[PDB]
Write a protein that binds this ligand. Sequence first.
Ligand SMILES: *[C@@H]1O[C@H](CO)[C@@H](O[C@@H]2O[C@H](CO)[C@@H](O[C@@H]3O[C@H](CO[C@H]4O[C@H](CO)[C@@H](O)[C@H](O[C@H]5O[C@H](CO)[C@@H](O)[C@H](O)[C@@H]5O)[C@@H]4O)[C@@H](O)[C@H](O[C@H]4O[C@H](CO)[C@@H](O)[C@H](O)[C@@H]4O[C@H]4O[C@H](CO)[C@@H](O)[C@H](O)[C@@H]4O[C@H]4O[C@H](CO)[C@@H](O)[C@H](O)[C@@H]4O)[C@@H]3O)[C@H](O)[C@H]2NC(C)=O)[C@H](O)[C@H]1NC(C)=O
Ligand SMILES: *[C@@H]1O[C@H](CO)[C@@H](O[C@@H]2O[C@H](CO)[C@@H](O[C@@H]3O[C@H](CO)[C@@H](O)[C@H](O[C@H]4O[C@H](CO)[C@@H](O)[C@H](O)[C@@H]4O[C@H]4O[C@H](CO)[C@@H](O)[C@H](O)[C@@H]4O[C@H]4O[C@H](CO)[C@@H](O)[C@H](O)[C@@H]4O)[C@@H]3O)[C@H](O)[C@H]2NC(C)=O)[C@H](O)[C@H]1NC(C)=O
Ligand SMILES: *[C@@H]1O[C@H](CO)[C@@H](O[C@@H]2O[C@H](CO)[C@@H](O[C@@H]3O[C@H](CO)[C@@H](O)[C@H](O[C@H]4O[C@H](CO)[C@@H](O)[C@H](O)[C@@H]4O[C@H]4O[C@H](CO)[C@@H](O)[C@H](O)[C@@H]4O)[C@@H]3O)[C@H](O)[C@H]2NC(C)=O)[C@H](O)[C@H]1NC(C)=O
Ligand SMILES: OC[C@H]1O[C@@H](O[C@@H]2[C@@H](O)[C@@H](O)O[C@H](CO)[C@H]2O)[C@H](O)[C@@H](O)[C@H]1O
Ligand SMILES: *[C@@H]1O[C@H](CO)[C@@H](O)[C@H](O)[C@H]1NC(C)=O
Ligand SMILES: *[C@@H]1O[C@H](CO)[C@@H](O)[C@H](O)[C@H]1NC(C)=O
Ligand SMILES: *[C@@H]1O[C@H](CO)[C@@H](O)[C@H](O)[C@H]1NC(C)=O
Ligand SMILES: *[C@@H]1O[C@H](CO)[C@@H](O)[C@H](O)[C@H]1NC(C)=O
Ligand SMILES: *[C@@H]1O[C@H](CO)[C@@H](O)[C@H](O)[C@H]1NC(C)=O
Ligand SMILES: *[C@@H]1O[C@H](CO)[C@@H](O)[C@H](O)[C@H]1NC(C)=O
Ligand SMILES: [Cl-]
Length: 968
Amino acid sequence: LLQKYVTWDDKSLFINGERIMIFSGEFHPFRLPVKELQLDIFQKVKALGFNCVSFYVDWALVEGKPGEYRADGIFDLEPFFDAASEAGIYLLARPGPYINAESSGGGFPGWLQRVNGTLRSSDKAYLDATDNYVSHVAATIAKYQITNGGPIILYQPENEYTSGCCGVEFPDPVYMQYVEDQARNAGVVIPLINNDASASGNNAPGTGKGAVDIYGHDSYPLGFDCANPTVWPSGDLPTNFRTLHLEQSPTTPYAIVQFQGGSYDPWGGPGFAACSELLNNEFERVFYKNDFSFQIAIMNLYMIFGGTNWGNLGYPNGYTSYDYGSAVTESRNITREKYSELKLLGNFAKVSPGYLTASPGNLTTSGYADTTDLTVTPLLGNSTGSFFVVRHSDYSSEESTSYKLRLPTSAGSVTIPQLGGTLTLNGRDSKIHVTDYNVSGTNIIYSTAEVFTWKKFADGKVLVLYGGAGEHHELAISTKSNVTVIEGSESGISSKQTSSSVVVGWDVSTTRRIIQVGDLKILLLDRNSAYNYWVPQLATDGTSPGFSTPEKVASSIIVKAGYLVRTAYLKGSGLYLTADFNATTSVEVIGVPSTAKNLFINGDKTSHTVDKNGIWSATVDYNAPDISLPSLKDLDWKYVDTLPEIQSSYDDSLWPAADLKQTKNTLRSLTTPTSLYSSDYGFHTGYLLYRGHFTATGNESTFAIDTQGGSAFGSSVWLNGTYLGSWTGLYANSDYNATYNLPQLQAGKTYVITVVIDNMGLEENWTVGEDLMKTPRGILNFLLAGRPSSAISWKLTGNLGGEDYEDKVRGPLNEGGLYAERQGFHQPEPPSQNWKSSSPLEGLSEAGIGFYSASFDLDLPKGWDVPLFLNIGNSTTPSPYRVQVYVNGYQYAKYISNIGPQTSFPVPEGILNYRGTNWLAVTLWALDSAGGKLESLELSYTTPVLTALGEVESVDQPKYKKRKGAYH
Ligand SMILES: *[C@@H]1O[C@H](CO)[C@@H](O[C@@H]2O[C@H](CO)[C@@H](O[C@@H]3O[C@H](CO[C@H]4O[C@H](CO)[C@@H](O)[C@H](O[C@H]5O[C@H](CO)[C@@H](O)[C@H](O)[C@@H]5O)[C@@H]4O)[C@@H](O)[C@H](O[C@H]4O[C@H](CO)[C@@H](O)[C@H](O)[C@@H]4O[C@H]4O[C@H](CO)[C@@H](O)[C@H](O)[C@@H]4O[C@H]4O[C@H](CO)[C@@H](O)[C@H](O)[C@@H]4O)[C@@H]3O)[C@H](O)[C@H]2NC(C)=O)[C@H](O)[C@H]1NC(C)=O
Ligand SMILES: *[C@@H]1O[C@H](CO)[C@@H](O[C@@H]2O[C@H](CO)[C@@H](O[C@@H]3O[C@H](CO)[C@@H](O)[C@H](O[C@H]4O[C@H](CO)[C@@H](O)[C@H](O)[C@@H]4O[C@H]4O[C@H](CO)[C@@H](O)[C@H](O)[C@@H]4O[C@H]4O[C@H](CO)[C@@H](O)[C@H](O)[C@@H]4O)[C@@H]3O)[C@H](O)[C@H]2NC(C)=O)[C@H](O)[C@H]1NC(C)=O
Ligand SMILES: *[C@@H]1O[C@H](CO)[C@@H](O[C@@H]2O[C@H](CO)[C@@H](O[C@@H]3O[C@H](CO)[C@@H](O)[C@H](O[C@H]4O[C@H](CO)[C@@H](O)[C@H](O)[C@@H]4O[C@H]4O[C@H](CO)[C@@H](O)[C@H](O)[C@@H]4O)[C@@H]3O)[C@H](O)[C@H]2NC(C)=O)[C@H](O)[C@H]1NC(C)=O
Ligand SMILES: OC[C@H]1O[C@@H](O[C@@H]2[C@@H](O)[C@@H](O)O[C@H](CO)[C@H]2O)[C@H](O)[C@@H](O)[C@H]1O
Ligand SMILES: *[C@@H]1O[C@H](CO)[C@@H](O)[C@H](O)[C@H]1NC(C)=O
Ligand SMILES: *[C@@H]1O[C@H](CO)[C@@H](O)[C@H](O)[C@H]1NC(C)=O
Ligand SMILES: *[C@@H]1O[C@H](CO)[C@@H](O)[C@H](O)[C@H]1NC(C)=O
Ligand SMILES: *[C@@H]1O[C@H](CO)[C@@H](O)[C@H](O)[C@H]1NC(C)=O
Ligand SMILES: *[C@@H]1O[C@H](CO)[C@@H](O)[C@H](O)[C@H]1NC(C)=O
Ligand SMILES: *[C@@H]1O[C@H](CO)[C@@H](O)[C@H](O)[C@H]1NC(C)=O
Ligand SMILES: [Cl-]
C-alpha cells in the first residue's frame, strides 16, 4: 500500500514478494537494559525457529519530564534494533502510547494525572500530551523499517482499543485515525496492525476511518490463575477463531498479536514457577497447534522473555519479577521443557510453505480419525500438501487413545497404518500429520510422525521426524527406491514397496534410527532426542545468520548438541559453530559442506570424526569453574538513618508545600482542604513522605488518615518522634483508613505528623473512559479530632526534583523520596566514611527506616554466563518489613516480608560487574514498634553455562555526587 517490502493477501504476509509465516515472541527492551543481553535473547529466539520479536516502548520511562524525550543510554532503542538485525529477527514495533504491559501507568507518565481530558480519547488535552513522545519514538522506528534496510516490518498503533465506558463514544474512529496518522507523519510506511483484546472486529479493514491494514486480536484462553497449574477448564480451548476471522477480516492474514506464553503474578501470588507449570510444554503443543488449525499466519507469544520490573517500572499489582513463566526465564536460561517443545513447532513452520497455501476446513470428530474421542482439523492443499491437526475432543483429557487415519493423498485415499498397528495420542498432546509434503522435490505421501526440519544438501536430502514415547508411526514416499536402515537396528522397522511408493512403519525409540530412500535420509527420533537438535542458518558471506529469507532458510544445517546452538558459518575450509553448553555435550553436524575440513566451536578448533553416513561428531567438555561469591553478611556494612524527619531538629523549610487548593486530577475531586495527591506535585514513584504541621490546643485525642499506595501498599505514621502505628498492607487493599491515638500534647507547641507511604506504582488504564491511571497516590482524607482540617499545613516529597528528576542515566522511576535516595546515597561510593558500622542482619530495634551500604568484589571467569541472585530469607514467619536493594544504583529488588512471594532476585551481568567492584544499598523499613531485621541476605548462583556470548560491558553507573537541590 505505501511500500512493497511487506505486503499481504488473505493467507499471509509477503516479505520481498515471498510468503512467510511470522512466528514472534514478546520482549520488552526496558525490562533488560543491558544491550549485550538483548542480543542473547534475540539469538535464543532465532534458535526456536522464530523470525520475529514484538516489543512495547514505555513512555513513562522516556518522557518523565513533559517536553523532554530521553531514550538514551540504557533506554536507547537503536542498539536493540541492531541486535535484532544481528540475530536475524524482524520486529513488530508497539510504542503505544498506551501499552498496559503490567507497567506503571500502563505506559502513561504520572503527569497525565494533570491532563484535563479523558485518557485514550480524541480530547485535545490528551492528544496534545502524546505528540512529543510519538513524534520521537515513531521517527526512531521509521529509521529502522525494512524499507531502509532495518528489521522493523509491522507497527501497532494503540493497544487493545476494545472496551469503553463512562460517556466516551467507543469506538471513536477520529481517535484511532489520529493515532495512526501520528505514526505516518513520523515516516512509518510499513503496515499497521491492531490487537483487539477479543475478536470484536474493531478497526478492521473496511470499517473506514481509523481502520488498520491488518486486523489482529489477542487470546489468553487458560487465564491467569496459576494456583491450579494442572487444571484445564472445560470449553476453554478456542474453536471458532477461523469462523470469526472470516466474518471480521477475511481479506487479511489471520493474526493473533498476543497469544498466551505465560502469565503475570500478583503480590502474594503463587509465584512464576506455578505459571511456568500452567503454560508448560503440554499447553504449548495442544494450544499452539490449535492456532495452526485456524491457519494462523502471524503469531506472537506474550511473553517469550519477560525480564524484570526493575526501578519501580511495574504496575501496583505486580512485584519485581516479570519472569512470566515464559519459554526464556528471567535469568535468561532455556532449561524449561516448554522452550524445547516450542522449538519443534517453530522449526516446522520455518520449512513448511504449503501450510500457508492450504484450505482450512472445520474441525471434525469423524471422517479423518476413526474415533470421536479425537478431533481433526484439516488444511487441504492439492499439489502443495495437506495438514491434519489431531487432538482429544475433550482437549483436557489425559487418556491414551488408539486410532487410525483415513487421509486423502495424491496417490489415493489411504487408511493409516497400512502395514498394521495403530497410532496413539497420549494425553495432553496434539499432532500435525502431513500429506504430500514437499522435501525439495521428493514427495512425502504421508507421515504420521511430525516434521522437525528438512534440508537439501550437496550429498542429498535429510528429513527429521519425531514421535512421543510408546507411539507407532508410519510414512510413505513417492519413489521406486527401496528403504535401507543405515543407522540403528532393523528391529521394529517394517516396510513394503508398491509400484510407485515405499511405505515404512516404525516404533518410537530412545535410540535414533536413520533410514535411506534414494537420496533422502530420514532421522526417526523420539521427542526428547529431538529437543537436542538445532537448525542454524549457515552464513557464507560473513558471520551473521541474516533474516529468515527463503535462500537463507534453505541454506541451513542440522546440529545435534545440548543447551544451545546460536549460529553457524562457513569460512574457507572451516565450519564454525557458536553454541552454549551446560553439560558435557556430544555434538553432531548433518549436512556439512563439501569444502569444510575443520570444525570450530566458539572459535576453538575441535577434533571431529566422520561416520559411515557423513555425519561429523565431536565432544565439548564441560568443567564448571570455581564460582567464588562473597558472604554478604560479612561485608563492611555502613548504616545511616533514612528517616531523620522524625527527629525534633529536622527542618523541612525547603520541602514543597502541599498547598494546592484545587486538584488538576479530573478523576477524584478533593476531600481535604489542599491536594495531598503526589502527582499534583510531580511525584509519581517510590516512597512518598508527607509532613503535617499544627499548633496543639492540648486536647487532641486521635488522628485519622486515609492513605493510598495501590495494592499491597503500606504506610507508617509518627507524631514528632512518637510512633503512632502502621498499615502493614494486604494485596486486597489499595487504600486504608486508620485512626491512631495521640500522646498527650502541650498547648501552644507545634507538632509535625510524618507519614511514609509506599507507592506501588500507578494503575493501568485498560478501559477507555474510566481514567483509572489517574487513581491518585498519597493522602485522601484526614481528621485531627476536635480540629478543623485547615489546622494542619502539609509538606510533601517523592523523588528529589519530581519531574525534574535527578538521575538521567537510570531514568525517572528508579528512586523514591527517602532522605538517602534524595541525597543520592544509593549510588556507588556514598559518603559513608564516618557512618556507623551496622548491618541489615542486625536491623532496627524500633519502627523506622534504615539505610545500609557495602561494596563487594566479583572476579568471575570470562567465557561463562553465570546467573546471580540476591536472596532474602523467610524460613520463619516474619515481622512486617519492607526492603529495596539498589545494585550499583539500580533498584533490582522490592520486598515485602509479610506479603511476598519473591525471596530470590536475579540481577544481570552489566548491572553487576563480574570482574570489579559492586555496591549494594539496602533500605529496611520496619512497620512495627519492636523494629525489624533481615533473617539472611545472600548472593547465590545457578548452573554456569560455557557461553559464546562476547564480553558484557557494564552499563553506566554514576557514582554518588552531592546534590544542590536536596533539602539539607
Ligand atoms: C541443562 O540444560 C538442559 C536444557 O537444554 C536442561 O534439561 C531440561 O531440564 C528440565 C528440568 O529443569 C526438563 O524438564 C523436566 O523434565 C522432567 C523429566 O521428564 C522428561 O524426560 C522424560 C525422559 O527422560 C520424559 O519421559 C518426560 O515426558 C513425559 O512427561 C512430560 C511432562 O510431565 C509430558 O509432557 C510427556 O508427554 C511425557 O509424559 C519429560 O520429557 C519432567 O518430569 C518435568 O516435568 C514437570 O515439571 C514441570 C515444571 O518445571 C511441569 O511443567 C510438569 O507438569 C511436571 O511437573 C511435575 O513435576 C514437578 C517437579 O519437577 C512438580 O513441581 C509438579 O508439581 C509436577 O509434579 C507431579 O508429577 C510428577 C510426576 O508424577 C511428580 O513429581 C509428583 O508426584 C506430582 O504429582 C520437567 O518438564 C527438560 O525436559 C530438560 N530438557 C532437555 C532438553 O533435556 C538441564 O536441566 C540443564 N542442566 C542443568 C544442570 O542446569
Ligand atoms: C514469608 O513467609 C510468610 C509465612 O509463610 C508469608 O506470609 C503469608 O503470605 C501469604 C501470601 O501473601 C498470605 O496469604 C494471603 O492472605 C490474605 C488474607 O490475609 C488473602 O487475601 C490472600 O489470598 C488472596 O490473594 C492472593 C494474591 O495475593 C491470591 O493469589 C489469592 O487467590 C487470593 O485472591 C483473592 O483476593 C484477591 C484480593 O482480595 C483477588 O484479587 C482475587 O481475585 C481473590 O478474590 C476473591 O476471593 C476473595 C477471598 O479469597 C474474596 O475477597 C472475593 O470473593 C474474591 O472474588 C492470601 O491467602 C498469608 O496470610 C501469610 N501467612 C502468614 C502466616 O502470615 C509471606 O508471604 C512470606 N514472604 C515472602 C517474601 O515470601
Ligand atoms: C532458570 O531461571 C529460573 C528463574 O530465574 C530459575 O528459577 C529460580 O531459581 C532460584 C534458585 O534455585 C529459585 O530460588 C530458590 O527457590 C527455592 C524454593 O523452591 C528456595 O529453597 C531457595 O532458597 C534457598 O536457597 C538460597 C540459595 O540459593 C538461600 O539464600 C535461601 O536462604 C534458601 O536456603 C535455605 O534453604 C535451602 C533448602 O530449602 C538450604 O539448602 C539452605 O542451606 C538454606 O537453609 C531459593 O529461593 C527460584 O524460586 C526460581 N524461580 C522461579 C521463578 O522458578 C532457575 O534456577 C534457572 N535455572 C538455571 C539452571 O539456571
Ligand atoms: O500479561 C497480561 C497482558 O494482558 C493483556 O490484556 C488483557 C488482560 O489483562 C485482560 O483484562 O483481558 C484480556 C484477556 O485476558 C487481555 O488481552 C495486555 O494487552 C498486555 O499488555 C498484558 O497486560
Ligand atoms: C517442491 O520443491 C521444489 C524445489 O524447491 C519446487 O521446484 C517444486 O515446485 C515444489 N513442488 C510443489 C508441488 O510445491
Ligand atoms: C527392500 O528392502 C527390504 C528390507 O531391506 C527387503 O526385505 C526387500 O527384499 C527389499 N526389496 C527388494 C526388491 O530388494
Ligand atoms: C516537633 O518537631 C518539629 C520539627 O519536626 C519541631 O520544630 C517542634 O519543636 C517539635 N515539637 C515538640 C513539642 O517537641
Ligand atoms: C477542566 O476544565 C474545565 C473547563 O475549563 C474546568 O471547569 C474544570 O475545573 C477543569 N478541571 C480540572 C480538574 O482541572
Ligand atoms: C476536650 O475534649 C473533650 C473530649 O472531646 C471534651 O469533652 C472537652 O469539652 C474538651 N475540653 C476543652 C477544654 O475544650
Ligand atoms: C475509607 O473511607 C473512605 C471515605 O469514608 C471510603 O470511601 C473508603 O471506601 C474507605 N476505605 C477502606 C479501605 O475501607
Ligand atoms: Cl534531602
